[PDB]
Design a protein around this nucleic acid. Structure first.
Ligand SMILES: [K+]
Ligand SMILES: [K+]
Ligand SMILES: [K+]
Ligand SMILES: [Mg+2]
Ligand SMILES: [Mg+2]
Ligand SMILES: [Mg+2]
Ligand SMILES: [Mg+2]
Ligand SMILES: [Mg+2]
Ligand SMILES: [Mg+2]
Ligand SMILES: [Mg+2]
Ligand SMILES: [Mg+2]
Ligand SMILES: [Mg+2]
Ligand SMILES: [Mg+2]
Ligand SMILES: [Mg+2]
Ligand SMILES: [Mg+2]
Ligand SMILES: [Mg+2]
Ligand SMILES: [Mg+2]
Ligand SMILES: [Mg+2]
Ligand SMILES: [Mg+2]
Ligand SMILES: [Mg+2]
Ligand SMILES: [Mg+2]
Ligand SMILES: [Mg+2]
Ligand SMILES: [Mg+2]
Ligand SMILES: [Mg+2]
Ligand SMILES: [Mg+2]
Ligand SMILES: [Mg+2]
Ligand SMILES: [Mg+2]
Ligand SMILES: [Mg+2]
Ligand SMILES: [Mg+2]
Ligand SMILES: [Mg+2]
Ligand SMILES: [Mg+2]
Ligand SMILES: [Mg+2]
Ligand SMILES: [Mg+2]
Ligand SMILES: [Mg+2]
Ligand SMILES: [Mg+2]
Ligand SMILES: [Mg+2]
Ligand SMILES: [Mg+2]
Ligand SMILES: [Mg+2]
Ligand SMILES: [Mg+2]
Ligand SMILES: [Mg+2]
Ligand SMILES: [Mg+2]
Ligand SMILES: [Mg+2]
Ligand code: NA
Ligand code: NA
Ligand code: NA
Ligand SMILES: [Zn+2]
Lengths: 255, 68, 88
RNA sequence: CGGGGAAACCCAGGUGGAGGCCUGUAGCGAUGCUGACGUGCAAAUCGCUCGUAUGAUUUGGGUAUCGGAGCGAAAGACUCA
RNA sequence: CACGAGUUGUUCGGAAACUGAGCACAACGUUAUAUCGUUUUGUUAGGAAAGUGAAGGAACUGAAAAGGGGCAACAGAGAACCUGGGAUUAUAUUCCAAAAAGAAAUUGCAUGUGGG
RNA sequence: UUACUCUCGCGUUGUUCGGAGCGGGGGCUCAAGAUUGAAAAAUGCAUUGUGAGUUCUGCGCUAAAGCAAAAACCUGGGGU
RNA sequence: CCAACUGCAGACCGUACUCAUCACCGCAUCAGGUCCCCAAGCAUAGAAUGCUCUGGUACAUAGAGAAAGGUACACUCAG
RNA sequence: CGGGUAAACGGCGGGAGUAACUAUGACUCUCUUAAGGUAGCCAAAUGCCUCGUCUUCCAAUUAGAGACGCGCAUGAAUGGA
RNA sequence: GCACCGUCUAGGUUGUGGGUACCCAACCGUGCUGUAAACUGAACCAACGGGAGUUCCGGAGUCUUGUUUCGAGACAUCUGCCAGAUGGGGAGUUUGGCUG
């Protein structure tokens, strides 16, 4: 046979990110001495849109702590942030929308976004538009904090990790039907070469395990083992169950 | 470690007798390999001999004597 | 006189994409082209530029919020919760 | 902007110029005559007729991905007859 | 077919001298084998890659500033000149000579004049 | 500036603007043109008035699509 | 040091011709293919189509000439 | 070994008796499966027999349409209408 | 057992112009001069003081049984080597004869 498309995508080539129009990575400030001991105050200068991203980005200007110059930061903007607003980041920052505080200083039951999984990572959780995390509890003896993630799972992180107060802007995006093939074309133009999609049963046996036959059909079960080699692991990978879900929907993911 | 045969995706052709990819061994020892590496890198010297100096889980170290 | 009975702005689609999908998109289409109230200044002059980006004609101020409306209902709840926790 | 109504709203006349909208050049294609030619003008062309023509549109230069492999809105199509 | 001729620029196009999709020298690593890999998400390399402003008494000597050296657009950025000619067999915004047919703009270095 | 007092006013072909300062009087400035002259008649060949077309320019700047970067240059804040 | 004035000097490569029913690819001076700029008058909605001033061309083997049968971006036919 | 899962691959029955003319069986026994095809639809691009049977269309229709259904071998995201 | 290494500290408790309003010492605290909904100013190449024109200190705390910091941690895909399952993802090969 020949190589399957899912395996071919791993070489890179014509399947990489279209990033020419993007403004750069979005991240928090660097966890420095001022952030660890006091606070820093910056000003929001502009709010902008980036190709391929549903949330708005904010440019925030700070003063350099050691030299005579200005520093510009690009961050994911929570809903309600406006130009001219003051942003406080550090240990002694007050509790308000847009500020960045250590998790140990945030009251239980609060809504946060742009959460650091590890201290100094500059934000890796709850970044897509309309998403957020919920603080559950603190453990002062262990120095840890419990969080509920957008997926519904629960995670424990060190209390030194930082977070921003509020929810990510741009929520409600997926409620509007697309209605046209051209709209999907423009939607994926800013992201990558992954559209349109061709069904596996519409291909030939040389290219896909589902191809061939005098009827369009899969001749074997479409649930495949976790141990299947690349080129064979297509379909429903290591599925615990199939079919329409009756009753409550369980939380997805590993134990 | 042992030598891995450099074929695309670990696929061999021909008789089944020549199908091993991981269990083959190089017909030349690591001391000779180290001497050849040094000699190819520094072409203005002459290699005389070498000896074993140390070893760990991943690496072996030899000392090579050269003359000008 | 009134030019359509049921579909106001979706009339540009003719007879194509189906009644229910057109109906669901109409509510969000109307919202994203209307003028919203500005708490700064006092005018109904907030217009969406790009998804999640709103600019005031009078204030000349830019605010981040909402894909198709200026403020999401979930945002209003969060502001009240944060204010209450701060006052503790 | 005219008329009606207690109110919610209803009827009529203009303005404006939306749409993977319609007729139709250039462009991009190739339905039928199973037409011409079939030691040809041509190792796939010619005539009339025909599809679409503001968009998932057409096109120049540059640049990236290949032979147990590449690419493919998927015909085992295409990769210098 | 044979013999003999013809393409003239401070300003036109390129380069000197930009960056883009991108390439891959050095460096490091790997391979029995470099003819392999990394090399723009501000950016090489376990990584000591800055070689001269002022000075100070006329050549020296050394402070400052993180992230090596290049290439890739004759349709993107950039770019100081126009008309007339009776001036060719063939070139011209390129040739014309003191009444330059003439009228300009711009770069480098020097000399007066004025001001400081 | 009792301008919107009780149908407020200005304005476009057109989807609007004003106590966060409309309209009127008098001014400052920018962009595109017009006019007077030098060039320029010494050249060229053997005239100055209206309608139609025409993207330079101005009218400031669909979208889950929101429209490259750098060299070079300009101005300012400090200091001398 | 700065402003006009003035004096001198302004280096390198390209530049003929073609761009196509004869100058390029298709074995060829092949009814195929090949990117860009300027685009007059009348009819008319008009870059449709028909004719015309400027510019260009008369190059495509020809002469004589009512057989049958053909091809045609050529027609007509009583009931 | 023991649990779950079909919008996973897939599957979804036969025999006889019986109503005051006859016919047909609402009804009753019997063998059996993991379950025995539900709502719908049809001589349909899926029906062998087959040019099925009735009506309509014509002077005359192996064609067309509307009905009927024991459906060789229709049927529900292998998606049905 | 006693010495030495081996010490400092923010803050808290107890009619117009130009100026004054301390020190205690002890505990708490642990390197602290700014904000406590928000709605766009500025900040660099030291002023000053002291010891012996030009130095050296302070302003700007000192020290290092030494790790850049944070999170794990002798576990771990962390490295190499043996061993067993699974494995059309892939390779090689085969798929008798007679015969109206
Ligand atoms: K694609
Ligand atoms: K199949
Ligand atoms: K098929
Ligand atoms: Mg990338
Ligand atoms: Mg097929
Ligand atoms: Mg296969
Ligand atoms: Mg199908
Ligand atoms: Mg399979
Ligand atoms: Mg090895
Ligand atoms: Mg072999
Ligand atoms: Mg060797
Ligand atoms: Mg059409
Ligand atoms: Mg034919
Ligand atoms: Mg086939
Ligand atoms: Mg010749
Ligand atoms: Mg010659
Ligand atoms: Mg990279
Ligand atoms: Mg680049
Ligand atoms: Mg570099
Ligand atoms: Mg250019
Ligand atoms: Mg030039
Ligand atoms: Mg010529
Ligand atoms: Mg008024
Ligand atoms: Mg020429
Ligand atoms: Mg031409
Ligand atoms: Mg010819
Ligand atoms: Mg030709
Ligand atoms: Mg007319
Ligand atoms: Mg024409
Ligand atoms: Mg015409
Ligand atoms: Mg001929
Ligand atoms: Mg002729
Ligand atoms: Mg004839
Ligand atoms: Mg007739
Ligand atoms: Mg049934
Ligand atoms: Mg049937
Ligand atoms: Mg008939
Ligand atoms: Mg029928
Ligand atoms: Mg089902
Ligand atoms: Mg079926
Ligand atoms: Mg550590
Ligand atoms: Mg095989
Ligand atoms: Na970019
Ligand atoms: Na093999
Ligand atoms: Na229109
Ligand atoms: Zn406002």
């Amino acid at each position: 046979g020949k190589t399957v498309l899912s395996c071919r995508k791993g070489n890179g080539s014509v399947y990489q990110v279209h990033g020419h129009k993007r403004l750069g990575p979005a991240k928090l400030r660097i966890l420095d001495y001022a952030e660890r001991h006091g606070y820093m105050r910056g000003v929001v200068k502009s709010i902008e849109h980036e190709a391929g991203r549903g949330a708005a980005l904010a440019r925030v200007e700070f003063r350099h702590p050691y030299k005579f110059r200005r520093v510009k930061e690009l961050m994911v903007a929570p809903e309600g942030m406006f130009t001219g607003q003051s942003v406080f980041c550090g240990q002694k920052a007050p509790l308000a929308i847009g500020n960045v505080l250590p998790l140990g200083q945030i009251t239980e039951g609060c809504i946060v976004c742009n959460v650091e999984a590890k201290p100094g990572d500059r934000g890796t959780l709850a970044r897509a538009s309309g998403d957020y995390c919920i603080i559950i509890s603190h453990n002062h003896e262990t120095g840890r904090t419990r969080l509920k993630l957008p997926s519904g799972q629960k995670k424990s992180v060190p209390s030194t990790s930082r977070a921003m107060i509020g929810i990510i802007s741009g929520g409600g995006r997926i409620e509007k039907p697309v209605l046209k093939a051209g709209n999907s074309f423009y939607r994926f133009r800013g992201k990558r070469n992954c559209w349109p999609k061709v069904r596996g049963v519409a291909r030939n046996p040389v290219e896909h395990p589902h191809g061939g036959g005098n009827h369009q059909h899969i001749g074997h079960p479409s649930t495949v083992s976790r141990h299947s080699p690349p080129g064979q692991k297509v379909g429903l990978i290591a599925a615990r169950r199939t079919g329409r879900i009756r009753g409550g929907k369980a939380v997805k993911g590993a134990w | 470690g042992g030598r891995k045969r450099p074929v695309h995706k670990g696929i061999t052709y021909g008789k089944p007798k020549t199908s091993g990819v991981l269990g083959m061994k190089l017909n030349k020892n690591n001391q000779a390999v180290a001497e050849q590496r040094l000699g190819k890198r520094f072409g203005n010297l002459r290699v005389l001999n070498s000896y074993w100096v140390n070893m760990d889980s991943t690496f072996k170290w030899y000392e090579v004597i050269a003359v000008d | 006189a009134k030019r359509t009975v049921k579909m106001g702005v979706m009339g540009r689609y003719g007879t194509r994409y189906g009644a229910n999908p057109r109906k669901r998109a109409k509510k969000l289409e109307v919202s994203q082209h209307a003028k919203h109230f500005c708490s700064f200044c006092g005018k109904f002059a907030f217009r969406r530029k790009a998804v999640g980006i709103w600019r005031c004609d009078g204030c000349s101020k830019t605010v981040a919020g909402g894909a198709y409306t200026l403020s999401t209902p979930n945002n209003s709840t969060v502001r009240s919760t944060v204010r209450r926790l701060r006052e503790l």
